[PDB]
Every structure is written in structure tokens, then in C-alpha cells.
Design an enzyme around this catalytic site. Structure first.
Site, PDB file in Angstrom:
ATOM      1  N   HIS A 198       0.811  -1.208   0.000  1.00 22.55           N
ATOM      2  CA  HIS A 198       0.000   0.000   0.000  1.00 22.55           C
ATOM      3  C   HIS A 198       0.851   1.268   0.000  1.00 22.55           C
ATOM      4  O   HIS A 198       0.295   2.373   0.060  1.00 22.55           O
ATOM      5  CB  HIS A 198      -1.003   0.040   1.169  1.00 22.55           C
ATOM      6  N   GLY A 203       3.174   5.975  10.156  1.00 26.07           N
ATOM      7  CA  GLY A 203       4.553   5.865   9.747  1.00 26.07           C
ATOM      8  C   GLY A 203       5.233   4.558  10.105  1.00 26.07           C
ATOM      9  O   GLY A 203       6.376   4.339   9.682  1.00 26.07           O
ATOM     10  N   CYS A 222       4.238   1.377   9.388  1.00 26.23           N
ATOM     11  CA  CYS A 222       4.073   0.249   8.479  1.00 26.23           C
ATOM     12  C   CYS A 222       5.411  -0.151   7.877  1.00 26.23           C
ATOM     13  O   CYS A 222       6.272   0.695   7.616  1.00 26.23           O
ATOM     14  CB  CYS A 222       3.076   0.597   7.381  1.00 26.23           C
TER      15      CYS A 222
HETATM   16  C1  LIG Z   1       1.169   2.598   8.591  1.00 28.89           C
HETATM   17  C2  LIG Z   1       1.201   3.356   7.237  1.00 28.89           C
HETATM   18  C3  LIG Z   1       0.557   4.767   7.289  1.00 28.89           C
HETATM   19  O1  LIG Z   1       0.649   5.424   8.274  1.00 28.89           O
HETATM   20  O2  LIG Z   1      -0.116   5.264   6.145  1.00 28.89           O
HETATM   21  C4  LIG Z   1      -1.251   6.075   6.346  1.00 28.89           C
HETATM   22  C5  LIG Z   1      -0.890   7.542   6.081  1.00 28.89           C
HETATM   23  C6  LIG Z   1      -0.121   2.705   9.405  1.00 28.89           C
HETATM   24  C7  LIG Z   1      -0.044   2.089  10.797  1.00 28.89           C
HETATM   25  C8  LIG Z   1      -1.451   2.351  11.555  1.00 28.89           C
HETATM   26  C9  LIG Z   1      -1.663   3.883  11.632  1.00 28.89           C
HETATM   27  C10 LIG Z   1      -2.328   4.112  12.989  1.00 28.89           C
HETATM   28  N1  LIG Z   1      -1.804   3.055  13.825  1.00 28.89           N
HETATM   29  C11 LIG Z   1      -1.268   1.953  12.922  1.00 28.89           C
HETATM   30  O3  LIG Z   1      -0.770   0.919  13.248  1.00 28.89           O
HETATM   31  N2  LIG Z   1      -1.096   1.968   8.585  1.00 28.89           N
HETATM   32  C12 LIG Z   1      -2.325   2.607   8.074  1.00 28.89           C
HETATM   33  O4  LIG Z   1      -2.559   3.747   8.309  1.00 28.89           O
HETATM   34  C13 LIG Z   1      -3.277   1.768   7.183  1.00 28.89           C
HETATM   35  C14 LIG Z   1      -2.864   2.250   5.788  1.00 28.89           C
HETATM   36  C15 LIG Z   1      -3.567   1.521   4.640  1.00 28.89           C
HETATM   37  C16 LIG Z   1      -3.419   2.107   3.234  1.00 28.89           C
HETATM   38  C17 LIG Z   1      -4.096   1.424   2.045  1.00 28.89           C
HETATM   39  C18 LIG Z   1      -4.916   0.152   2.275  1.00 28.89           C
HETATM   40  C19 LIG Z   1      -5.063  -0.433   3.682  1.00 28.89           C
HETATM   41  C20 LIG Z   1      -4.386   0.252   4.876  1.00 28.89           C
HETATM   42  N3  LIG Z   1      -4.651   2.006   7.469  1.00 28.89           N
HETATM   43  C21 LIG Z   1      -5.093   1.845   8.868  1.00 28.89           C
HETATM   44  O5  LIG Z   1      -4.292   1.541   9.691  1.00 28.89           O
HETATM   45  C22 LIG Z   1      -6.576   2.047   9.254  1.00 28.89           C
HETATM   46  C23 LIG Z   1      -7.318   0.828   8.698  1.00 28.89           C
HETATM   47  C24 LIG Z   1      -8.860   0.954   8.865  1.00 28.89           C
HETATM   48  C25 LIG Z   1      -9.579   2.271   8.551  1.00 28.89           C
HETATM   49  C26 LIG Z   1     -11.104   2.365   8.720  1.00 28.89           C
HETATM   50  C27 LIG Z   1     -11.906   1.141   9.195  1.00 28.89           C
HETATM   51  C28 LIG Z   1     -11.186  -0.177   9.504  1.00 28.89           C
HETATM   52  C29 LIG Z   1      -9.661  -0.270   9.334  1.00 28.89           C
HETATM   53  N4  LIG Z   1      -6.698   2.100  10.692  1.00 28.89           N
HETATM   54  C30 LIG Z   1      -7.025   3.366  11.373  1.00 28.89           C
HETATM   55  O6  LIG Z   1      -7.193   4.360  10.752  1.00 28.89           O
HETATM   56  C31 LIG Z   1      -7.142   3.374  12.916  1.00 28.89           C
HETATM   57  C32 LIG Z   1      -8.338   2.504  13.368  1.00 28.89           C
HETATM   58  O7  LIG Z   1      -9.472   2.807  12.588  1.00 28.89           O
HETATM   59  C33 LIG Z   1     -10.453   3.578  13.257  1.00 28.89           C
HETATM   60  C34 LIG Z   1     -11.674   3.753  12.339  1.00 28.89           C
HETATM   61  C35 LIG Z   1     -12.604   3.884  11.624  1.00 28.89           C
END
Ligand SMILES: *[C@@H](CC(=O)OCC)[C@H](C[C@@H]1CCNC1=O)NC(=O)[C@H](Cc1ccccc1)NC(=O)[C@@H](Cc1ccccc1)NC(=O)CCOCC#C
Ligand SMILES: *[C@@H](CC(=O)OCC)[C@H](C[C@@H]1CCNC1=O)NC(=O)[C@H](Cc1ccccc1)NC(=O)[C@@H](Cc1ccccc1)NC(=O)CCOCC#C
Lengths: 302, 305
Positions: A41, A143, A145
């Protein structure tokens, strides 16, 4: 003596951590030999994260769209490909700090060390367990991931986890190093959640053996139980069924302590049905289930 | 989100761990620049360790009695000195992997990462706190002496602990890297009791703030207490007194959560008087006191090193 949540030394992994950027998206990658592994991603954009078509999104990329930084030295990408949910970027230099390593897919109830990283730089290390519902209770921020989980057997690093997502409930989901998610999760920004988690019975028993080794013995009783009678009380309190393979795994701890596994099971049954009565075991007022039998021997053997 | 017992990355320290052998006794040393630091009781023999005179024991040694192994290279000892309870072996080669470092003496309540080592090889890393009774609740076995504790700040490793001893209760005692023991303990093969301990109040509050930041809010209440009234409860429950300095240290967390410190203190008071009623906070059924306010900020803000 003493018992702590103990991770593996993180240096061998620190030497493999890099930063990978595509577009404005930056995250961590794992640099082993001449390949960098990272979540796919990294090629998404904000609007696209909902239902991303990774095949097409990767078509539009060239080697030079992937910026890879190891420290303040840029690595040059000379090939790219996708394996399930991870990208593999071939670079023109092998990592000189590459350790002996393997990729393994771990089973629920197993533990591993996480090196949490941001912008290719490590921030901390801690111990996790693959929960039975295939989440991990991690500590991850935006950040993070691409951070990886690992075990070290001698000098060989067994990588088992790469971080991708945080679920609505605050727990975490990711993949093995071949890009296959643990659990029923997908790399989409959609409605996802595996609730209903269970306690890892064989780990609680190992931790009770650790307590005995360390001189905490108040919970030992003279009673005994059978595996079926124990398992009846277990599932009532949301414990995994105990199997004979589990009993056998605890053989070494049973031998060290003189306490048969089924006698320990009888102590455990009483703890579940009566609580601990304002007492503690190994400094905890709860029954801990994120130490495997091997974690206990490793830390009570050295 | 999430909150874990998080140690610092240990790679900078792993690069400094060596093996020190004197006679039949082997333990770990710390190789910084051209000096190797280790516990002075490496020079003891089974017929001495009770009430050793360490000055006599060292006069009776020579450089060649010391056998220092950095991975798979032998370091040549060219000098030896004793400072308090730490032996300093000058070697002929400076450690190329020496990080920027400081020697710091930490205060009770302060936390640090421990790199547990055996035969000069790192084995694991965990977080500890200097207890108010000047012990640490470590995890150590035979062969672990010379393992060190440390904190990191950007690129500077602040070493604050070197391991020497396990007390009869199973907790641990050691020195700073200047060789001075924490507390009243000594490097003699004698039983020396850990005194009565106390709970690190400011750390408990920091961990309650960590809980709020990570969505655990059930213990919050509408009340605010005074410092005096809070400290009346603290003494009864064997908690350290809360000081204005502690209140100031918690500033950043009170800012991030919008919850004033004395507001949080009223939650802590209620938890102490009524317990937790079968509930947990950040996966714990007890009030945790081995996270400092900086530990919370570092983890919940992603500080890197
Ligand atoms: C790492 C990469 C990143 O930061 O990119 C985004 C700018 C993070 C680690 C997460 C961030 C918060 N704590 C973590 O461990 N990964 C993400 O942000 C993923 C990125 C992604 C991009 C494309 C396709 C899939 C995932 N996304 C999330 O971590 C979301 C996933 C989510 C969102 C909405 C419903 C269910 C699951 N999680 C999130 O935002 C926090 C919990 O969700 C609350 C709600 C609603
Ligand atoms: C490190 C020594 C080492 O690595 O060198 C190898 C030869 C260990 C760490 C201990 C070992 C078990 N777990 C630990 O953390 N340090 C020691 O063994 C010291 C060594 C020492 C030598 C000379 C002068 C002072 C200390 N000794 C101890 O830790 C003893 C101290 C002691 C002596 C007599 C009665 C009570 C305590 N601790 C000990 O035996 C703990 C268990 O016994 C408690 C009782 C009774």
C-alpha cells in the site's frame, strides 16, 4: 531470578531497516541481500485507499518511482514486483549487514519481537503474541508500516510479521514476509474487525511454571484433574482447549519443577473459578498468556 | 495506538559488549573507546569473595591475567584500574562501534533498557525502573554480570546501570558506570536485604495518561483533588509523595489529553480506595509504575533514535 517481557536484541534487524517512498507516501522496508520488502500500500493515494487496484497502480510505476534510503545513502531500484500484499524492490547493492535469516509463518499463540520504526529509523522494541483471532496487540503509530516482527535462533533471524494496519479496536494486523495476511484482513481502508479473542491456555500454564521456578507457589494445590474436566472449565472462561501436544510441550517445564501438567491444570482451574484473592503472580494480578513454553525456558535458562 | 513495555533499540549497545575472563571467572564487559568496563568482582576467587579486599586483589593481578574477547578478536590489555566497584581495562584498540555516550546516575523512578548478556553475547532486552528502595526488578541468571542499562537521546547512549548482584528476594543491585552502587548494597557474597519499597506515583499518573491517549477512559471522574489531599491518600497506600516538580513533568501529557494533573489525581485516589472492580487498564489489573512521563511521550509520539 526475575521474569520480564523480554524481546530479542534488535541490532541485527536495525541494520536491515530502510525508508521506502512512493509519491508522498513513506514507510519502512526490510533490506535483505539485494531486495527490499515493504507493504504494497506504499503505492496507494489517499482517495484510492478505499478499494485499491494494486495491479493497475503498480503498472503505472517505474523503478525510479521508488525512493529507497538506507541511512543517508540512496539505494537504486533496478526492479520491482508484487508478492501477495508485499512489494519486492530489487536494488543494485546487497545489504552488507544482512544476517543469516529465514522467512517463517507463525501460528496463533506464538510470540515474537517487534522493532517499531519510523522513516527507516528504529524507535523501540517489544514482545508480542499472535492472538488466536490473528491480530496482535502492538504499539504502532502513523509511519510504522513496514516494521517487522522476528525471532532469533542463535544468529539466524526468523522474520514472521510485517506491519500493515490498525483495526478499529486498537489492535493490529499484518502479513508474513511473503505478503500473506494473518487472519481475514485485506489491505483496504474498509470496515474490518475480528473481535471475540480467546486466551492462550498453554502460555498461561507456561507462565505459571515460570512463577513456580521463581518461587511464587501460593496457587499450587494438592488436587488434580483430567484433560476433559479441565477443558470444560477452560472454554467456560474463554480459554483455548488444552491438547496433548500442549501437555507434551510443557514436559520440560514440568520436569524442572516436579509439577505434572495436570496438577498445574488443577491449580489453574481453581484460579479461574475463585480469582487470586487480591494476590499476585510474577507481579501481575491477571493470568498472563503471551509467554510461550520456549519463552519461559529461554528466560529461566539463558 | 497500543501501549507496550518498550525498550530502546539495543544495536548501539550490542556493539560494545565483550567478554572478560580472569582466571576461571568470565562475565561481560562494556567496550567504549579503548576502555573495557566490568564489575570488579571478576577478580575474586571462591576463597576471597566473602570479605575481599579488592585493592589487594588487583595489586596481585597483571594485564596478562585479563582475557578480553570482542566477538572473535582478542583485545590486548595494556592497563588496569579500579574506580569504586567497576574495573577499567585499557585495551590496545578503540572500539570502532563506540556511540556517542554519557555516564549518568539515575534517580529512583527513572526507567531504562537492560541488555541481558552472557559470555559477551546479547541475549535479550527489557525495560526496568530504579525502584525507590534502589533495587531493580530485573531478569538475570548466572553469567549476566556486566550487563548494562541505558537510555538513548537521538544518538547519545546514556549508560546508567551495570549489573552485579541478585538479592535473596530475587531483585537486583548494581552500580552506575562510575562504579557506585545504587543504594546501600556492596559487592560481597553476603545476604543484603531489599528494604521496603514504594510505588512511583508520578509514573502511575503517566501510565493513566497513556491509557487515556489509547482510549481507556473508564476510571476518569468529574472530581479534582488538592495536592495535599491526594498526598494524604498516597502515604496511606505506600505511594511516593507527589511534588510540584512531578506536576510540571506531567505537563505535556495533561496538555495532550486536556486533563489537568490534579484531575487525574482524583482518578488515582478513587482507584486506590475502591480498586478496579474486575476491570483492566491497558491490559493490567494493577496500577503500573514503571513508565515515566517521557516513556509515554516517546512511545505515543514515535520518537526515533
Ligand atoms: C502505517 C502506514 C501509514 O501510516 O499510512 C497512512 C498515512 C499505518 C499504521 C497504523 C496507523 C495508525 N496506527 C497503525 O498501526 N497503517 C495505516 O494507516 C493503514 C494504511 C492503509 C493504506 C491502504 C490500504 C489499507 C491500509 N490504514 C489503517 O491503519 C486504518 C485501517 C482501517 C480504517 C477504517 C476502518 C477499519 C480499518 N486504521 C485506522 O485508521 C485506525 C483505526 O481505525 C479507526 C476507524 C474507523
Ligand atoms: C553475575 C556474576 C557473573 O556473571 O560472573 C560469573 C562467575 C551474577 C548475577 C546473579 C546470578 C544469579 N542471578 C543474578 O543476577 N552475580 C553474582 O552471582 C554475585 C557475584 C558476586 C561475587 C563477589 C562479590 C559480590 C557478588 N553474587 C550474588 O548475586 C549473590 C549474593 C548473595 C551471597 C550470599 C547470600 C545471599 C546473596 N546472590 C544470590 O546468590 C541470589 C540467590 O541466593 C539468595 C540467598 C540466600
Amino acid at each position: 531470578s526475575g521474569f520480564r517481557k523480554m524481546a530479542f536484541p534488535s541490532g541485527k534487524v536495525e541494520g536491515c531497516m530502510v525508508q521506502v517512498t512512493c509519491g508522498t507516501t513513506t514507510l519502512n522496508g526490510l533490506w535483505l541481500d539485494d531486495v527490499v520488502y515493504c507493504p504494497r500500500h506504499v503505492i496507494c493515494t489517499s482517495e484510492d485507499m478505499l478499494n485499491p487496484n494494486y495491479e493497475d497502480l503498480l503498472i503505472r510505476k517505474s523503478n525510479h518511482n521508488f525512493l529507497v534510503q538506507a541511512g543517508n545513502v540512496q539505494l537504486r531500484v533496478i526492479g520491482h514486483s508484487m508478492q501477495n500484499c508485499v512489494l519486492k524492490l530489487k536494488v543494485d547493492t546487497a545489504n552488507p549487514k544482512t544476517p543469516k535469516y529465514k522467512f517463517v509463518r507463525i501460528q496463533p499463540g506464538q510470540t515474537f519481537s517487534v522493532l517499531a520504526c519510523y522513516n527507516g529509523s528504529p524507535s523501540g522494541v517489544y514482545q508480542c503474541a499472535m492472538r488466536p483471532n490473528f491480530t496482535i496487540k502492538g504499539s504502532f503509530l502513523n509511519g510504522s508500516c513496514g516494521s517487522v516482527g522476528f525471532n532469533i535462533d542463535y544468529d539466524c533471524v526468523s522474520f514472521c510479521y510485517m506491519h500493515h494496519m490498525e483495526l478499529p479496536t486498537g489492535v493490529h494486523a499484518g502479513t508474513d514476509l511473503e505478503g500473506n495476511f494473518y487472519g481475514p484482513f485485506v489491505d483496504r481502508q474498509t470496515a474490518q474487525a475480528a473481535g471475540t479473542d480467546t486466551t492462550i491456555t498453554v502460555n498461561v500454564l507456561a507462565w505459571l511454571y515460570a512463577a513456580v521456578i521463581n518461587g511464587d507457589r501460593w496457587f499450587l494445590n494438592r488436587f488434580t484433574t483430567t484433560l476433559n474436566d479441565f477443558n470444560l472449565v477452560a472454554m467456560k472462561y474463554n480459554y483455548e482447549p488444552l491438547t496433548q501436544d500442549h501437555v507434551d510441550i510443557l514436559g520440560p517445564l514440568s520436569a524442572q519443577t516436579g509439577i505434572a501438567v495436570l496438577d498445574m491444570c488443577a491449580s489453574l482451574k481453581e484460579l479461574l473459578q475463585n480469582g487470586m484473592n487480591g494476590r499476585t503472580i510474577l507481579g501481575s494480578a491477571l493470568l498472563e498468556d503471551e509467554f510461550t513454553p520456549f519463552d519461559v525456558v529461554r528466560q529461566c535458562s539463558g
